[PDB]
Design a protein around this ligand. Sequence first.
Ligand SMILES: O[C@@H]1CC(F)(F)C[C@H]1O
Ligand SMILES: O[C@@H]1CC(F)(F)C[C@H]1O
Ligand SMILES: O[C@H]1CC(F)(F)C[C@@H]1O
Ligand SMILES: O[C@H]1CC(F)(F)C[C@@H]1O
Ligand SMILES: [Zn+2]
Ligand SMILES: [Zn+2]
Lengths: 372, 372
Amino acid sequence: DRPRFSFSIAAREGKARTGTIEMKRGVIRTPAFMPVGTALKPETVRATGADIILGNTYHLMLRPGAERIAKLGGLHSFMGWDRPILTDSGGYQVMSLSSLTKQSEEGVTFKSHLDGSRHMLSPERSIEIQHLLGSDIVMAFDESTPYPATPSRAASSMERSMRWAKRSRDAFDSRKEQAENAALFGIQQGSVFENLRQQSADALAEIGFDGYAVGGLAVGEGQDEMFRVLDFSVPMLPDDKPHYLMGVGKPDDIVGAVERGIDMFDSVLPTRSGRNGQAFTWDGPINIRNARFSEDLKPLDSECHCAVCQKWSRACIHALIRAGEILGAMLMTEHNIAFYQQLMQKIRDSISEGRFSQFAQDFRARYFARNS
Amino acid sequence: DRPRFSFSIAAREGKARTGTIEMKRGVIRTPAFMPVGTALKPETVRATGADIILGNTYHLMLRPGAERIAKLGGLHSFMGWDRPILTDSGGYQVMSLSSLTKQSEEGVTFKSHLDGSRHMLSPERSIEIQHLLGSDIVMAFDESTPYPATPSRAASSMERSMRWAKRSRDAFDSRKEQAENAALFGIQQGSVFENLRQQSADALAEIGFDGYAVGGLAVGEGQDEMFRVLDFSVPMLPDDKPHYLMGVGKPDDIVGAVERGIDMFDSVLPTRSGRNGQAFTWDGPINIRNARFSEDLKPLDSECHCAVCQKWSRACIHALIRAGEILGAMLMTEHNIAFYQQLMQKIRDSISEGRFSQFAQDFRARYFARNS
Ligand SMILES: O[C@@H]1CC(F)(F)C[C@H]1O
Ligand SMILES: O[C@@H]1CC(F)(F)C[C@H]1O
Ligand SMILES: O[C@H]1CC(F)(F)C[C@@H]1O
Ligand SMILES: O[C@H]1CC(F)(F)C[C@@H]1O
Ligand SMILES: [Zn+2]
Ligand SMILES: [Zn+2]
């Protein structure tokens, strides 16, 4: 009988941790990379090593809608994925994609960018929709602050997000079926300001969550500043719960964030890159359309274990992509997701062995030299 | 205003001829290879160089049926092919694929190998069905004689085929719409027996046809015997009309048959081979699954002009075929059909220049050496 949500840390190296999150639908190895499920077949995504995938609540509530997904048996049935699923709250895409009808402390009303219909989100509505989807990890509904943000705008959005964090907690707790079977994460805000980040961390820990996300990063600030913020922000969160850096990111972002105490990641990059003919390798990204690959019989990456690199050469993936054959994009996408999982596995193994700091240095030296 | 059917011989070398057949729907360059249309897109088949394709009346009358094809606008609309189409009579597949309900001088009744329905063919019914299909070149309905055949069985089938040839002529002539716009070919029979072949040729020329096929070959006799029969059979046919060797064949069969006066060919070989991972080349056929092709960056054939050989290497087609990707079979099939058309073009050009005998010797020396 597996538990609702149990995070265990097996080994540490400095701020880095490796361990497991046990949930009813499966075990998640940490640090973890979550592909964004919202295409490759689900058995392909699983075979790359993914233990959990992410669903975008905003996209799902527009098409086909949360009520429809529930009638179809829930998001796991809808996606053909029977392991854990994390859903975001929808609030970020409201800011970034929709046209706002109204915004206040109550919540937000917005217009679908698809057909113009009006929708509403709030701590209570977001948690309810994530319940209809049936996801395993539920994100609190918060208010995003653009980059760059003034200290006053960062502070007012963080403070609203904390009141909304309490509202998300209470909504999640109001449904026995959700509270007994799913988990709830809260989201730290405060932009780049240490005092606001501490304010936010204190508020989240007072409410109490199963995990803590660092929000408000990866939105234009640059890696140097992101790392500086992580340096003081992650230690503010409870040590014995997972730390989730939302929307990150590039392989070097992931390594440096694990060095700073992050346990969980999501990003569309591997998928977006694969559709655009870009492959991740230990020697940095490559653009497979480049003429130098037309007769290159080596795999995309000569150390990658993925099914694509066992069989397919750069030359033949180049040919497929140049012809516009969808198989080319599928192969690149599978390799990119698998490469990300192999990166996470090397991170986990190196932390376990107490050689992650060295791995990170070796990784950066090679990744940025770009001898591909 | 193009004519119903006009065959012009532009150049000769010994028994070999090159020229054109002008029909309302287009010009056919001879000697001609007809792909069997009954998949690649029709624009792809045209771009390989095919001027005319063949439709199998037996398959079309079983699924979706001739009346349905007519309601859909005819075989040209059904196949997306607006150039000439030759239809066979259906009689060969009756022998080779169906279960016969009844056979007599009247015609034949048979059971569909698909759903067991009963169908009837005869000179009159075959011509009527080919009219419903709307094909440009109509084959007389004849009676096939298996290989090997006794002289008595060869003689009785040839004699019935000639009475049926007259019946086909009269049925075709009975429909003004067909007789004014299509052409009718008769089929010489007689197995390997010179006197029966002459009997058959005399009967066909007395009736009068737009073209003359050599039937009863390519059914197990071997190339040596086929060539021996062609040696005396083709000169018996009218010189100023096209000569059509049905169901042939391998590239070396085609070359030797042109040396013996044949103008037209059809075969499923290029398609069947392409689906099975076999490519035709000037150095003989190759099996692309062979390990020696896994790192071979050369095209399937290093002289072939086809779209596949401009772009795709043996290595990558090997990869596709080994993975079971349908693209692999499509590429092989396109290359094989295009290779056949390039063979016909070299035949036409070499006859025009008076160097076809030399081309044939050079072709065989290289094709059979197999230095691929
Ligand atoms: O149960 C399924 C097995 C799988 F193919 F890996 C995807 C799962 O949802
Ligand atoms: O009219 C069409 C042009 C083509 F693509 F080559 C096939 C014809 O039937
Ligand atoms: O996006 C596709 C693949 C997935 F596994 F991510 C879930 C869905 O079936
Ligand atoms: O078989 C396919 C391709 C063809 F051109 F041969 C006719 C049909 O559309
Ligand atoms: Zn790979
Ligand atoms: Zn070719």
